[PDB]
């Protein structure tokens, strides 16, 4: 029932999480529970993963439309 409500939510979430990651002190970094300390090698791969998820959420939004 309106397959865009989830797709539009995820595009906003992934776009904001991708934008908030450029700030190393944003609250978006506090969600990685299983990591005791967030070293520099974690933030490099997290930036990449969040960019990929934004691209997926970008395509899924256009597909529902």
């Amino acid at each position: 029932f309106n397959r865009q409500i989830p797709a539009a939510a995820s595009l906003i979430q992934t776009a904001w999480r991708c934008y908030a990651a450029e700030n190393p002190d944003s609250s978006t970094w506090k969600i990685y529970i299983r990591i005791s300390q967030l070293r520099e090698h974690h933030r490099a791969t997290i930036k990449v993963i969040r960019r990929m998820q934004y691209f997926v959420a970008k395509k899924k939004f256009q597909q529902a439309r």
Partner: protein, 139 residues
């Protein structure tokens, strides 16, 4: 703009994904990194992520494909602005901070309250979130 330092940074980021050194990122290697960070993705998620970057249909990601992905910017502001319209009920250009928090923390990726706080706290004055300001900040 053909940045130079970014290549040195990107090649390092590509190395953390390509444990082989065969110049190729596969879904197994993508899931290995995600699982190391406490994430539990599915094969559909992993290949959706690789299909999005695999420009030549190889099924994998080489460094120049990674570099094109990282060099992208954000156009894409119309799609994001259209995404907010799904949750703009009055059509005025505002989402309620209570509505945004409810939709963002419960649907899709599920942000945290403090994550949504940064959204509302960037937004303006009384709980009426101007999403056009948000579309602007990320672009």
């Amino acid at each position: 703009q053909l940045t130079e330092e970014q290549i040195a940074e990107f090649k390092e980021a590509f190395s953390l994904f390509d444990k082989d050194g065969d110049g190729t990122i596969t879904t197994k290697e993508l899931g290995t990194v995600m699982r190391s960070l406490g994430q539990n993705p599915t094969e559909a998620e992993l290949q959706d992520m690789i299909n999005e970057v695999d420009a030549d249909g190889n099924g994998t990601i080489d460094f120049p494909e990674f570099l094109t992905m990282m060099a992208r910017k954000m156009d894409s502001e119309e799609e994001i602005r259209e995404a907010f319209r799904v949750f703009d009920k009055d059509g005025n250009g505002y989402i309620s901070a209570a509505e945004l928090r409810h939709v963002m923390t419960n649907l899709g990726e599920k942000l945290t309250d403090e994550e949504v706080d940064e959204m509302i706290r960037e937004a303006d004055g009384d709980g009426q979130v101007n999403y056009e300001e948000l579309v602007q900040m990320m672009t």
